[PDB]
Design a protein around this ligand. Structure first.
Ligand SMILES: OC[C@H]1O[C@H](O[C@H]2[C@H](O)[C@@H](O)[C@@H](O[C@H]3[C@H](O)[C@@H](O)[C@@H](O[C@H]4[C@H](O)[C@@H](O)[C@H](O)O[C@@H]4CO)O[C@@H]3CO)O[C@@H]2CO)[C@H](O)[C@@H](O)[C@@H]1O
Length: 490
């Protein structure tokens, strides 16, 4: 078999706010010159937020798809494909967020009077960037539940963009499932202080989550159990907490029970919404995808504090990612792992960071459950170092000169298309990165040639029970990585 079978596509994220809060496509001409640059570089496609808070701004079911229609048209004129994010979250409080885009005002209005629709920490701070899982199924939004809102939105998108869907412009629909569009709790909000190598806080204090928790413990036989109260604050270190120190609460029954409850709320949140997405896009030539954050800090300590916290119940003896991957399998979805570039040695020692290990764990789990795996770089990088790291992760065992590689990622979405990137020296490097992702081949317009043809979305396979999902917590050894890519940028 051909080298082309080694190709991994590359996408570029568009700038935040290319459609402003006013639902206006501000600078088509500018963008256009940029896109044309990417097309000549050999880039396969681009990724864009489809902000819920811009589209359904006016009131319920008052969608205005016009400015996005224009943008998609321009992308299509430029010969690029497109990855569309159903962004049901706010833009603004996270790293890199240069523009503020909130959720719909009319939703915000409701929260003015029912504060418990937001994620809440133990101190009672309400985070407005995303609606809490606790209201997925509460019909308090003018008669709709939150899941109905998301679902209606995706249906509308589907019907209103059907021409672009059928012309094959859109290749994947990333379903936003939490803050920054990631399936996670907002445990590390910059907007509340949080600073890097801090552990973050559990976000289950809104009333619906607290009531669910309380009923559940009571059924377990411990009505008396409460939500954690010894876990510290955003910027603690684990050892400084009752919850996470050795022999702390996290390894008690109560803690295990809690952690399981907490992490399972995510799994079910993701499963239910993907169900809705599957039905909305049924028949379309697209794949669905979700985003999983890379919480590499504290990875190297037994407690994995930041991971727990974000709702990833990952320990050294409990795989907290593989169950997500298994969940994705019934929906035929892709796991988009949002941190691919970092090296362990670039982290402060005191953060006990294990980014490379975390990567191998996550991709291996996906590959093992037989799903497709994609990823992004978490932070803006322009150096060969970062690029060669992404290339290694893309094809962990190198290129197969006589067939398809044994392990390969399904795609990688580079972080942001800025002025800096297009600078002459930066862009020259990038061009190389693109070439080596492409395995030394020229850009290949027909994906069928590299074994990526998209077939019409089928219906989801049947619900897998939580027990079965949870079997995937059994630790496995990762697949073997090369120490260095065989296809470096230098
Ligand atoms: O336009 C698409 C979306 O883009 C933005 O969200 C993306 C994040 O910016 C990107 O970093 C990533 O998400 C998480 C990373 O996996 C995780 O490592 C972390 O980044 C850390 C970093 O590891 C650490 O060293 C540094 O010092 O602190 C950072 C922590 O904040 O958190 C990231 C976010 O949870 O992928 C996201 C989605 O593509 C926009 O904010 C989002 O609104 C857009 O939808």
């Amino acid at each position: 078999s051909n080298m082309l079978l080694n190709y991994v596509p590359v996408y570029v994220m568009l700038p935040l706010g290319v459609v402003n809060v006013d639902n206006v496509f501000e600078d088509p001409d500018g963008l256009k010159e940029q896109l044309l640059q990417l097309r000549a570089a050999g880039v396969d496609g681009v990724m864009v937020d489809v902000w819920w808070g811009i589209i359904e701004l006016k009131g319920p079911k008052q969608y205005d798809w016009r400015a996005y229609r224009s943008l998609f048209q321009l992308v299509q004129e430029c010969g690029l494909t497109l990855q569309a994010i159903m962004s049901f979250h706010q833009c603004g409080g996270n790293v890199g967020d240069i523009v503020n885009i909130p959720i719909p005002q009319w939703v915000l209005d409701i929260g003015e009077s029912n504060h418990d629709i937001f994620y809440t920490n133990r101190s009672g701070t309400r985070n407005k960037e995303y609606l809490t899982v606790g209201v997925d199924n509460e019909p308090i939004f003018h008669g709709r539940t939150a899941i109905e809102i998301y679902s209606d939105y995706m249906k509308s998108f589907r019907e209103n963009m059907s021409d672009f869907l059928e012309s094959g412009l859109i290749i994947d629909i990333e379903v936003g499932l939490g803050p920054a569009g990631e399936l996670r709790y907002p445990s590390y909000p910059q907007s509340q202080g949080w600073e890097f190598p801090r552990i973050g806080e559990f976000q289950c204090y809104d009333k619906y989550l607290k009531a669910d928790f309380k009923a559940a413990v009571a059924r377990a036989g411990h009505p008396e159990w409460e939500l954690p109260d010894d876990a510290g604050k955003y910027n603690d270190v684990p050892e400084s907490t009752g919850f996470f120190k050795s022999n702390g609460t996290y390894v008690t029954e109560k803690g295990k029970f809690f952690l399981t409850w907490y992490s399972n709320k995510l799994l079910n949140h993701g499963d239910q919404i993907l169900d809705e997405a599957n039905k909305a896009f049924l028949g379309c030539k697209v794949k669905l995808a979700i985003k999983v954050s890379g919480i590499h800090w504290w990875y190297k300590v037994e407690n994995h504090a930041a991971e727990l916290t974000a709702g990833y119940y990952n320990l050294n003896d409990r795989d907290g990612y593989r169950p997500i991957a298994r969940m994705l399998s019934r929906h035929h979805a892709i796991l988009n792992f949002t941190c691919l570039e970092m090296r362990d040695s670039e982290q402060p020692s005191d953060a006990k960071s294990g980014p490379q290990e975390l990567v191998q764990q996550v991709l291996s789990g996906g590959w093992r459950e037989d799903i497709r795996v994609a990823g992004e770089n978490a932070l803006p990088r322009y150096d060969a170092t970062a690029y060669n790291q992404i290339i290694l992760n893309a094809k962990p065992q190198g290129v197969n000169n006589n067939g398809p590689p044994k392990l390969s990622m399904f795609g990688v979405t580079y972080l942001r298309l800025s002025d800096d990137l297009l600078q002459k020296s930066n862009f020259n490097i990038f061009k190389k990165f693109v070439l080596k992702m492409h395995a030394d081949q020229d850009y290949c317009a027909n994906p069928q040639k590299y074994n990526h043809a998209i077939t019409p979305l089928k219906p989801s396979a049947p619900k897998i029970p939580i027990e079965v999902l949870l079997e995937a917590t059994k630790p496995t050894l990762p697949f073997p990585w090369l120490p260095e890519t065989d296809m470096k940028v230098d």
